[PDB]
Write a protein that holds these residues in place. Structure first.
Motif, PDB file in Angstrom:
ATOM      1  N   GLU C  56       0.902  -1.198   0.000  1.00 45.56           N
ATOM      2  CA  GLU C  56       0.000   0.000   0.000  1.00 45.56           C
ATOM      3  C   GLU C  56       0.872   1.159   0.000  1.00 45.56           C
ATOM      4  O   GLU C  56       1.900   1.219   0.632  1.00 45.56           O
ATOM      5  CB  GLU C  56      -1.060   0.143   1.191  1.00 45.56           C
ATOM      6  CG  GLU C  56      -2.056  -0.991   1.257  1.00 45.56           C
ATOM      7  CD  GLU C  56      -2.656  -0.975   2.677  1.00 45.56           C
ATOM      8  OE1 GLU C  56      -3.108   0.092   3.174  1.00 45.56           O
ATOM      9  OE2 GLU C  56      -2.394  -1.986   3.349  1.00 45.56           O
ATOM     10  N   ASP C  57       0.544   2.192  -0.863  1.00 47.64           N
ATOM     11  CA  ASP C  57       1.184   3.467  -0.590  1.00 47.64           C
ATOM     12  C   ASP C  57       0.055   4.204   0.112  1.00 47.64           C
ATOM     13  O   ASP C  57      -0.173   3.855   1.264  1.00 47.64           O
ATOM     14  CB  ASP C  57       1.751   4.151  -1.864  1.00 47.64           C
ATOM     15  CG  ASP C  57       2.164   5.573  -1.722  1.00 47.64           C
ATOM     16  OD1 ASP C  57       2.045   6.213  -0.645  1.00 47.64           O
ATOM     17  OD2 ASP C  57       2.569   6.223  -2.720  1.00 47.64           O
ATOM     18  N   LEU C  58      -0.780   5.071  -0.498  1.00 48.09           N
ATOM     19  CA  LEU C  58      -1.874   5.706   0.209  1.00 48.09           C
ATOM     20  C   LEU C  58      -3.051   4.887  -0.143  1.00 48.09           C
ATOM     21  O   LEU C  58      -2.953   4.021  -1.016  1.00 48.09           O
ATOM     22  CB  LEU C  58      -2.040   7.237  -0.006  1.00 48.09           C
ATOM     23  CG  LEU C  58      -0.854   8.118   0.550  1.00 48.09           C
ATOM     24  CD1 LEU C  58      -1.281   9.555   0.311  1.00 48.09           C
ATOM     25  CD2 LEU C  58      -0.607   7.895   2.056  1.00 48.09           C
ATOM     26  N   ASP C  60      -6.260   2.154   1.171  1.00 48.92           N
ATOM     27  CA  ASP C  60      -6.290   0.708   1.482  1.00 48.92           C
ATOM     28  C   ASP C  60      -6.576  -0.035   0.191  1.00 48.92           C
ATOM     29  O   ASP C  60      -7.562  -0.720   0.045  1.00 48.92           O
ATOM     30  CB  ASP C  60      -7.295   0.163   2.496  1.00 48.92           C
ATOM     31  CG  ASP C  60      -6.953   0.510   3.898  1.00 48.92           C
ATOM     32  OD1 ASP C  60      -7.866   0.378   4.778  1.00 48.92           O
ATOM     33  OD2 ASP C  60      -5.813   0.916   4.222  1.00 48.92           O
ATOM     34  N   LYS C  67       6.488   1.772  -1.123  1.00 47.24           N
ATOM     35  CA  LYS C  67       6.331   1.902   0.323  1.00 47.24           C
ATOM     36  C   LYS C  67       7.757   1.733   0.740  1.00 47.24           C
ATOM     37  O   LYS C  67       8.430   0.907   0.153  1.00 47.24           O
ATOM     38  CB  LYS C  67       5.496   0.814   1.078  1.00 47.24           C
ATOM     39  CG  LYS C  67       5.711   0.782   2.611  1.00 47.24           C
ATOM     40  CD  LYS C  67       4.800  -0.388   3.102  1.00 47.24           C
ATOM     41  CE  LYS C  67       3.362   0.041   3.537  1.00 47.24           C
ATOM     42  NZ  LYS C  67       2.605  -1.136   3.987  1.00 47.24           N
ATOM     43  N   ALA C  68       8.184   2.542   1.762  1.00 47.79           N
ATOM     44  CA  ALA C  68       9.547   2.684   2.210  1.00 47.79           C
ATOM     45  C   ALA C  68       9.942   1.354   2.764  1.00 47.79           C
ATOM     46  O   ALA C  68       9.235   0.725   3.508  1.00 47.79           O
ATOM     47  CB  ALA C  68       9.750   3.609   3.474  1.00 47.79           C
ATOM     48  N   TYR C  71      11.262   0.005   6.679  1.00 43.01           N
ATOM     49  CA  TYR C  71      10.349  -0.620   7.656  1.00 43.01           C
ATOM     50  C   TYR C  71       9.196  -1.155   6.832  1.00 43.01           C
ATOM     51  O   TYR C  71       8.476  -0.487   6.104  1.00 43.01           O
ATOM     52  CB  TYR C  71       9.766   0.366   8.725  1.00 43.01           C
ATOM     53  CG  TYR C  71      10.858   0.871   9.606  1.00 43.01           C
ATOM     54  CD1 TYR C  71      11.400  -0.017  10.596  1.00 43.01           C
ATOM     55  CD2 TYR C  71      11.331   2.130   9.649  1.00 43.01           C
ATOM     56  CE1 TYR C  71      12.383   0.412  11.479  1.00 43.01           C
ATOM     57  CE2 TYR C  71      12.385   2.522  10.460  1.00 43.01           C
ATOM     58  CZ  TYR C  71      12.806   1.737  11.458  1.00 43.01           C
ATOM     59  OH  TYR C  71      13.735   2.246  12.407  1.00 43.01           O
ATOM     60  N   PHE C  72       9.059  -2.490   6.947  1.00 43.26           N
ATOM     61  CA  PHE C  72       7.912  -3.183   6.435  1.00 43.26           C
ATOM     62  C   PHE C  72       7.069  -3.636   7.606  1.00 43.26           C
ATOM     63  O   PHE C  72       7.599  -4.197   8.602  1.00 43.26           O
ATOM     64  CB  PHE C  72       8.368  -4.493   5.687  1.00 43.26           C
ATOM     65  CG  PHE C  72       9.099  -4.206   4.403  1.00 43.26           C
ATOM     66  CD1 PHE C  72      10.490  -4.211   4.263  1.00 43.26           C
ATOM     67  CD2 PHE C  72       8.354  -4.078   3.278  1.00 43.26           C
ATOM     68  CE1 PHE C  72      11.078  -4.144   3.017  1.00 43.26           C
ATOM     69  CE2 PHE C  72       8.949  -3.844   2.063  1.00 43.26           C
ATOM     70  CZ  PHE C  72      10.300  -3.879   1.880  1.00 43.26           C
ATOM     71  N   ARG C  73       5.780  -3.392   7.466  1.00 38.32           N
ATOM     72  CA  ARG C  73       4.759  -3.495   8.461  1.00 38.32           C
ATOM     73  C   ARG C  73       3.452  -3.576   7.764  1.00 38.32           C
ATOM     74  O   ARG C  73       3.236  -3.059   6.616  1.00 38.32           O
ATOM     75  CB  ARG C  73       4.640  -2.298   9.444  1.00 38.32           C
ATOM     76  CG  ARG C  73       4.618  -0.950   8.790  1.00 38.32           C
ATOM     77  CD  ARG C  73       4.745   0.185   9.802  1.00 38.32           C
ATOM     78  NE  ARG C  73       6.186   0.297  10.230  1.00 38.32           N
ATOM     79  CZ  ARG C  73       6.415   0.610  11.523  1.00 38.32           C
ATOM     80  NH1 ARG C  73       5.412   0.749  12.449  1.00 38.32           N
ATOM     81  NH2 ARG C  73       7.635   0.789  11.960  1.00 38.32           N
ATOM     82  N   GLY C  74       2.522  -4.258   8.526  1.00 33.83           N
ATOM     83  CA  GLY C  74       1.164  -4.473   8.115  1.00 33.83           C
ATOM     84  C   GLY C  74       0.793  -5.982   8.351  1.00 33.83           C
ATOM     85  O   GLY C  74      -0.407  -6.311   8.254  1.00 33.83           O
ATOM     86  N   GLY C  75       1.711  -6.912   8.655  1.00 32.86           N
ATOM     87  CA  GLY C  75       1.590  -8.316   8.742  1.00 32.86           C
ATOM     88  C   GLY C  75       1.937  -8.861   7.372  1.00 32.86           C
ATOM     89  O   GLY C  75       1.190  -8.569   6.408  1.00 32.86           O
ATOM     90  N   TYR C  78       1.568  -9.161   2.704  1.00 31.96           N
ATOM     91  CA  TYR C  78       0.250  -9.470   2.220  1.00 31.96           C
ATOM     92  C   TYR C  78       0.328 -10.519   1.161  1.00 31.96           C
ATOM     93  O   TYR C  78       1.023 -10.471   0.185  1.00 31.96           O
ATOM     94  CB  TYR C  78      -0.616  -8.279   1.689  1.00 31.96           C
ATOM     95  CG  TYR C  78      -0.482  -6.944   2.532  1.00 31.96           C
ATOM     96  CD1 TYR C  78      -0.296  -5.701   1.837  1.00 31.96           C
ATOM     97  CD2 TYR C  78      -0.501  -6.904   3.952  1.00 31.96           C
ATOM     98  CE1 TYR C  78      -0.167  -4.528   2.524  1.00 31.96           C
ATOM     99  CE2 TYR C  78      -0.369  -5.728   4.618  1.00 31.96           C
ATOM    100  CZ  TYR C  78      -0.280  -4.528   3.952  1.00 31.96           C
ATOM    101  OH  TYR C  78      -0.093  -3.329   4.690  1.00 31.96           O
ATOM    102  N   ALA C 101      -1.818 -14.304   5.944  1.00 32.72           N
ATOM    103  CA  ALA C 101      -0.492 -14.008   6.503  1.00 32.72           C
ATOM    104  C   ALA C 101       0.165 -15.298   6.848  1.00 32.72           C
ATOM    105  O   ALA C 101       1.095 -15.383   7.719  1.00 32.72           O
ATOM    106  CB  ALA C 101      -0.527 -13.180   7.871  1.00 32.72           C
TER     107      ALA C 101
END
Lengths: 280, 150, 150, 150
Positions: C56-58, C60, C67-68, C71-75, C78, C101
């Protein structure tokens, strides 16, 4: 030869190297000079537009406090697109006949303006160019259609409908086939509904201007004011280049004429601009 | 609403809604609100309540929604139900959390009807933002035209 | 001369996402499938992604990369449970996608390890930050369009 | 080094008969090559060139047109198709080339659009309009090329 491509033989009869213009344009689709222009720099476009606000509503009982709202926006990306046309030319031909040269430039300019309107509305994108504005905008308004009502009537009926919507309307953005058909499909009287046929009405409908853009498609009429709905950011403007240093034109006497512009699109109200499809 | 004045103050959620053993990315599964350290409460201490929209982070952590001038993170946005707190809908951060789309009813700024988003400063708000995308599913109970859980 | 790369001019085929690992089940906390990652239909960068991987950038909404990568995050990054993408935009099925996940095979993009920044063609390359979080297979030098198991 | 020594494989196929009606030879008539530039690799298999044009002359040699740096004459103007062998197999470079007048199979090596036909001396480009067909509604240029005649 004994002729250039002539019908009879020059040797038999007829001499002259002076010749009139035969070249002519077909299918106009202008809308860029109608719209406002902006400069842009940068190799991609990001736009933000405001969506509906989340406020409170009370359909029943007023004494309480509406829920507060905050400015919420949705995003669009627009990559650059390239609009172009190319011409292959024979200088010997051009110098002898004479007007061809003038025709080529004025045609190329019209041609750039033409292609730009087509991609911007929609005309098949490969995910490499500006987004398809015509798809995203408001569906067909069934309300306008009085059930079994004339095509010309539809275009009159729609103009007023946009005024109820509270969107500016100065002008009708219609398809060329829909406009002709609209003119032809009029009541039982010689006089048309927009105004009689002893008034010039070829280029005006409903007493508002007519903007012909191609690829707005048949049986669709879109009211708007062009300036308001979209805005035209220009990364680089229309420029001709001519090359005798290109590989295949050099070898030959031939000269290659490029006409191109690199454009982008801004949507100032892509979340509105009313459109209808006749069901009549 | 009933004789001698309708609803007032806070109003009771669902308690001890236990969801566990899920295979996906949902917030429903027993999992933490993390800001950093080691979780909350001693024995015989009861949680607080906190309503808003939370966002899934790295690993099996949730934290609060912030900006929109930073990247959107994790799946759907959700609001917190109880299962450690004995009081209403809500949870205290650093517990196993079940979330729902029910958070009934603790007031906080704006409303949550028709999905919720995160605003460009970090408040929580309702839809419709994108019409070309589906945002975090928090479909609220009827309660409109008055301040409420987002 | 003249060769497209990304943006829907490269064919990367199709690959199965229910192959390798544990396979979860269909549930929420998902996100929407479209071309562009904050864009709109017919306007999106694209990696060498096919099936597997989309960030995701902006909003949902998902499509490949962006996306930077500090740091990868979100679970996880995907993954798709029980629909296999029929496009080679990475994902852009045009439905709301329920995500998972569990350990699940992905398609990568860009040369070198993702621990860097984003290239705006839909790729990872090395940035000024190093020893940042990697994706999938480790100990192994990843290249553009590698098949990793998460 | 480079292919075009000994018995070697093929680009345009082997021993083609009946590949053209009235625009190309249907009997085997092949004959040996005095070569121009074939680019980075000898006797083709690369971006630039691919084995250029020959035109028949009296003797047991057929040799270069040679058109530089990619000029073309329309209708018939001779193209090299298949090869034959008698002591060495492969398309040109001192081996037997079968020619036609613009017949099949032609199959030359490029990147992207153009392609087109190659001569000796120049880079891989495609002829324009007033060099091949400018009959009816057509696009061809020096940026636009496909394997076959336009």
């Amino acid at each position: 030869m004994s002729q250039l491509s002539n019908q009879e033989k020059e040797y038999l009869i007829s001499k002259a190297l002076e010749t009139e213009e035969g070249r002519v344009a077909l299918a106009q689709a202008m809308a860029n000079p109608i719209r406002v222009s902006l400069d842009y720099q940068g190799v991609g476009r990001k736009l933000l537009v405001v969506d509906p606000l989340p406020q409170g509503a009370l359909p029943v009982y007023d004494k309480d406090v509406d829920a507060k709202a905050f400015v919420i926006s949705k995003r669009g990306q627009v990559p650059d697109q390239v609009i172009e046309g190319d011409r292959i030319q024979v200088p010997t031909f051009e110098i002898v006949s004479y007007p061809q040269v003038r025709f080529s430039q004025v045609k190329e300019r019209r041609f750039n303006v033409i292609d730009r309107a087509q991609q911007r509305a929609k005309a098949d994108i490969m995910a490499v160019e500006d987004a398809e504005i015509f798809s995203l905008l408001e569906g067909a308004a069934t309300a306008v259609n009085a059930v079994t009502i004339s095509s010309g009537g539809l275009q009159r009926a729609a103009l007023t409908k946009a005024f109820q919507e509270v969107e500016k309307h100065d002008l009708v953005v219609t398809k060329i086939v829909m406009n002709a058909s609209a003119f032809a499909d009029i009541r039982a009287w010689g006089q048309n509904e927009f105004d009689p046929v002893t008034q010039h009405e070829v280029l005006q409908t409903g007493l508002f201007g007519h903007i012909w853009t191609a690829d707005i498609l048949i049986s669709k009429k879109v009211p708007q004011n062009t300036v308001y709905v979209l805005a035209d950011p220009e990364f680089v403007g229309v420029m001709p280049i001519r090359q005798d240093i290109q590989v295949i034109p050099a070898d030959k006497p031939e000269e290659l004429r490029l006409g191109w512009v690199i454009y982008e699109e801004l949507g100032l109200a892509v979340v509105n601009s009313l459109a209808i499809a006749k069901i009549s | 609403p009933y004789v001698r004045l309708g609803y007032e103050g806070i109003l009771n959620g669902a308690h001890d809604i236990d969801v566990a053993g899920l295979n996906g990315v949902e917030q429903l599964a027993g999992k933490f609100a993390t800001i950093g350290a080691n979780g909350v409460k001693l024995a015989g201490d009861n949680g607080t309540n906190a309503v808003g929209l939370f966002r899934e982070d790295l690993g099996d952590m949730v934290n609060a929604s912030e900006k929109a001038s930073f990247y959107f993170r994790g799946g759907e946005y959700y609001v917190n139900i109880s299962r450690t707190s004995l009081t209403a809908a809500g949870i205290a951060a650093g517990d196993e959390i079940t979330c729902d789309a029910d958070g009934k009813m603790i007031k906080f700024t704006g409303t949550g009807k028709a999905l919720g988003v995160v605003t460009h400063v970090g408040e929580y708000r309702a839809g419709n933002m994108y019409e070309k995308a589906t945002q975090g599913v928090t479909d609220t109970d009827t309660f409109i035209g008055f301040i409420m859980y987002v």
